Design a binder for this molecule. Structure first.
Ligand code: TTP
Ligand code: CA
Ligand code: CA
Ligand code: CA
Ligand code: CA
Ligand code: CA
Ligand code: CA
Ligand code: CA
Length: 901
DNA sequence: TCGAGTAAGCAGTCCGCG
DNA sequence: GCGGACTGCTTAC
């Protein structure tokens, strides 16, 4: 097999590389890599190396990496550009793996671990590590085993061994319900003392050294705790054994307020699953506790226990160990579904970077572009410093707030990447500038043609047309991968809808789910077999289809993220190819494209409707238009349609056969106007929206920019078994809005769009009457909590104190003195509740850590003093009043003459 | 919240507005 | 009471 790296590091003048050799075995090597860098030279000097602008360079070969770094510094002292890849390990990977890497994941040791630390006096700080580590569960992907290290004797209690038999039993048997599928995979090791536990863990780690190291909060908690505890007991040299090269660095990480420490383990790639989840999941969660996320992702019940976690080991060591094991398993289950490790490996090997660098699109793209240029013997420019400067973005149309009955939407496929490719925007394709007219003049096609030679953006920039830039070339490659995965995702989605339909008529039989590839649209034969299947088999198939859809979603949306982040990197001062001229060329072209096509669509529809000045485009944001279809439906007449699906078909056909060709003609003209390299503006239909045929539903409404709801029957070619709400920006979509309130507002919206005013009024009246019975967590607001210290003046709110921070200060006074009470962590999320006048907490609100029950010390009093009236008004009535006033509906029945009878 | 970008919405504070 | 200046937070692209 072809060799591939596992990890790479620079340590002084050596590269340390762990790799898989041609026989599939893990090896390590130290290489005295001599890096090269480059300086500009005279034309009279014969060279093969040129910078991206075509200027000749001489290659400087250094005796070692330190010599190279020193040269860069002296070049700065002289005032001359030092060209080339200054991150020497990326140059090493490029030289050592000069081919497309094919990796074999089965050979990569992926370790997933979690530790337990009993602490009586509050949160056990990793930097201090003052308490014994009393459990470690470490799952190894190569062995497929859970290695459990269990401390039986501690200063906080001596306990009996954990029992695998009880662990396996149902909770109704007094057991722990450790999943039966992992029972046989547990290797249990009890220890009489912590010193032996840790020495054995280190010997184990040496034998089975992680390449990828993951878990939940492993980077911020488990790793620094283990390192520091070992350091405290044995000394630094022993703790450094967590690195295969015995090198570690305390790394200080900082944002806007304050900083924290992590331990860099040289020769390991730490991908903390909480951070993978945050970057790649496209959620914003009220809580990031593993319990909360596991419940959300997997629909598994919260791991229940009596009393605080600080007393769990002494009171129920059995459950304590089983819960540690289950926690490790939960992360593996989340990864089986979301596949973020697979994503990271794919992206990392594609770019030829340390796998942990997938968190940085700047590093990822720097490596991709360097590798690409190096292939042509071209030399990358030196990174420079730039001051942070603002630049303009997208155009968003101001919608008239209203109900909108029939709507068809359209938006550009990968808009900004497509603009980059179409215009040929790249650092080395800049050709010059032209005199800019006001944007309105380009939108209306009255400005003079920018260039008859070069490809243009309405910000004034011109680009070469003779050859593709490296940015267009490389962005296209990732875009093509994105397109492939999106195809699989949508097929799985369409397949899911087939199963949902079949589930209306399940067969009374005993059978099996069909063995199929959900990434491909079901054949006629498969469809026929599905119609004969039982509910059990159909539901299993649906689950599998939905898992395939999620897998495709991860692969496609994060490739979309990668290419969109190349655009974004052009506007980040740390990117080697930072250039506000190029970032603004993209955004200004975007503004033109949207407004140009708005004009074209309005013109087209006015023509086919025989009107003048009618605005068919009611809204658009960045690269999208929303077209009112009322007049199209009315041209045929509603009574002509057999059912909802009939008019959906009709609008679908109209969009595909009439609208899209008109849109395409419009953009081709724009391409010619701007003299672009290639027409790539592809504005495909997104949604077909409207009320159910014959209902009183309003179909859709807008309240403002970035705030709307549509009742959708077809989304990008997926014809739903049941209509689905597309809601953007409204409170149902915000993580700050209480859970039960999101749910209620969504049902209000459903009723508005599908059923009408009277249905809405019925539901509202019921919710208002019953909501005080809702569990307090479900009606609590959520907020991130930054700068608690800033607004804390002797335990009381300082000037301009935010509402949620005020709540935290209230909480802090109420739990004062107790080291046992959960502390609100700076920068994390809190639940927030309003409190009635005269309450014993002495302020108008209280906040506590999100994803948790408020501590028993104050729970009863919070429950007694919760201000339900304020809750309802702020979170439910105010937003609902917004939706209904926009839609020109009333959520409460107004008086009429009929009342008199 | 270490980690690519801008536009733009709403909650809340402070305080004017005769 | 609402609206502007401002902070804080969050979402649509
Ligand atoms: C979602 C998103 C969009 N954008 C910008 C670039 C996008 O091309 C543009 C339009 O956003 P989208 O319409 O959300 O995405 P897209 O057009 O790139 O891809 P597709 O519609 O095919 O799924 O907005 C970002 O810069 N960052 C982002 O995270
Ligand atoms: Ca735990
Ligand atoms: Ca788009
Ligand atoms: Ca599309
Ligand atoms: Ca059937
Ligand atoms: Ca869009
Ligand atoms: Ca009490
Ligand atoms: Ca206001």
């Amino acid at each position: 097999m072809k060799e591939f790296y596992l990890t790479v590091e620079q340590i002084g003048d050596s590269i340390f590389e762990r790799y898989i050799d041609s026989n599939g075995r893990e090896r390590t090597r130290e290489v005295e890599y001599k890096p090269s860098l480059f300086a500009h030279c005279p034309e009279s000097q014969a060279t093969k190396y040129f910078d991206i602008y075509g200027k000749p360079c001489t290659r400087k070969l250094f005796a070692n990496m330190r010599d190279a770094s020193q040269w860069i510094k002296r070049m700065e002292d002289i005032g001359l550009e030092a060209l080339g890849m200054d991150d020497f390990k990326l140059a090493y990977l490029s030289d050592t793996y000069n081919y497309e890497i094919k990796y074999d994941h089965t050979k990569i040791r992926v370790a997933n671990f979690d530790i337990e630390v009993t602490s009586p006096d509050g949160f056990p700080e990793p930097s201090q590590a003052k308490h014994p580590i009393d459990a470690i569960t470490h799952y190894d992907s190569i062995d497929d085993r859970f290695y459990v290290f269990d401390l039986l004797n501690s200063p906080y209690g001596n306990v009996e061994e954990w029992s695998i038999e009880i662990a396996a039993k149902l909770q109704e048997q007094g057991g722990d319900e450790v999943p039966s599928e992992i029972i046989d995979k547990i290797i249990y090791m009890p220890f009489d003392n912590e010193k032996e536990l840790l020495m054995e863990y280190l010997n184990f780690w040496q034998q089975k050294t992680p390449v990828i190291l993951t878990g939940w909060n492993v980077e911020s908690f488990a790793i620094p705790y283990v390192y520091n505890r070992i350091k405290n007991i044995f000394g630094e040299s022993t703790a450094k054994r967590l690195s295969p090269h015995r090198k570690t660095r305390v790394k200080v990480i900082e944002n806007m307020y304050g900083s924290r420490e992590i331990i860099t383990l040289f020769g390991i790639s730490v991908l903390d699953y909480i951070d993978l989840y945050k970057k790649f999941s496209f959620t914003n969660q009220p809580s990031y506790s593993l319990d909360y996320i596991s419940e959300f992702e997997l629909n598994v019940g919260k791991l229940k226990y009596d009393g605080p976690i600080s007393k769990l080991r002494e009171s129920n060591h059995q459950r304590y160990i089983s819960y540690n094991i289950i926690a490790v398993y939960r992360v593996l289950q989340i990864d089986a579904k979301r596949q973020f490790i697979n994503l990271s490996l794919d992206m990392g090997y594609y770019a030829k970077i340390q796998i942990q660098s997938v968190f940085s699109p700047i590093k990822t793209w720097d490596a991709i572009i360097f590798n690409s240029l190096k292939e042509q013997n071209k030399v990358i420019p030196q990174g420079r410093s730039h001051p942070v400067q603002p630049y303009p973005g997208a155009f968003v149309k101001e919608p008239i707030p209203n109900r909108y009955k029939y709507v068809m939407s359209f938006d550009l496929t990968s808009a900004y990447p497509s603009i980059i490719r179409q215009v040929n925007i790249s650092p080395e394709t800049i050709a010059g500038t032209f005199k800019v007219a006001p944007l309105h003049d380009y939108i209306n096609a009255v400005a003079e043609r920018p260039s008859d030679v070069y490809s243009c953006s309405p910000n004034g920039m011109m680009y070469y047309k003779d050859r593709d830039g490296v940015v267009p070339t490389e962005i296209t490659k990732v875009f093509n991968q994105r397109k492939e995965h999106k195809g699989y995702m949508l097929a799985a989605q369409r397949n899911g809808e087939i199963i949902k339909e079949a589930l209306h008529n399940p067969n009374l039989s005993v059978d099996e789910p069909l063995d199929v590839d959900y990434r491909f649209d079901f054949s006629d034969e498969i469809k026929e077999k599905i119609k004969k299947l039982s509910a059990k088999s159909l539901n299993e198939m649906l689950f599998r289809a939905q898992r395939t859809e999620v897998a495709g979603m991860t692969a496609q949306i994060n490739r979309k993220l990668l290419i969109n982040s190349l655009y974004g990197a052009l506007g980040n001062v740390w990117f080697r190819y930072y250039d506000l001229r190029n970032a603004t060329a993209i955004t200004t072209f975007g503004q033109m494209a949207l407004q140009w096509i708005e004009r074209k669509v309005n013109e087209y529809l006015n023509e086919v409707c025989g009107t003048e000045g009618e605005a068919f485009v009611l809204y658009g944001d960045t690269d999208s238009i929303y077209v009112s279809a009322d007049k199209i439906i009315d041209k045929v007449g509603e009574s002509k349609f057999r059912d909802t699906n009939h008019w959906v078909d009709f609008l679908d056909k109209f969009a595909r056969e009439r609208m899209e060709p008109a849109i395409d003609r419009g953009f081709r003209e724009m391409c010619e106007y701007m003299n672009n390299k290639q027409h790539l503006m592809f504005m495909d239909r997104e949604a077909i929206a409207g009320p159910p045929l014959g209902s009183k539903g309003i179909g859709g409404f807008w309240t403002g920019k970035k705030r709307y709801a549509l009742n959708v029957w077809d989304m990008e070619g997926t014809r739903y078994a049941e209509p689905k709400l597309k809601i953007m920006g409204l409170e149902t979509q915000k993580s700050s809005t209480p859970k039960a309130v999101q749910k209620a507002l969504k049902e209000c919206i459903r009723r508005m769009l599908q059923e009408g005013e009277e249905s809405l009024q019925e539901y509202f009246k019921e919710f208002e009457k019953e909501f005080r019975q809702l569990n307090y967590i479900s009606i609590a607001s959520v907020s991130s909590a930054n700068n608690i210290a800033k607004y804390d003046v002797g335990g009381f709110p300082g000037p301009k104190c935010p509402f949620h921070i005020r709540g935290i200060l209230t909480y802090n006074r109420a739990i004062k003195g107790n080291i046992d009470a959960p502390q609100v962590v700076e920068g994390e999320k809190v639940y927030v509740l309003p409190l009635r006048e005269g309450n014993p907490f002495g302020d108008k609100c209280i906040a506590w850590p999100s994803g948790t029950e408020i501590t028993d010390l104050i729970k009863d009093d919070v429950l007694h003093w919760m201000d339900y009236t304020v809750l309802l008004e702020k979170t439910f009535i105010k937003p609902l009043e917004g939706f209904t006033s926009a839609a020109k509906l009333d959520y409460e029945k107004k008086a009429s003459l009929f009342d008199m009878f």
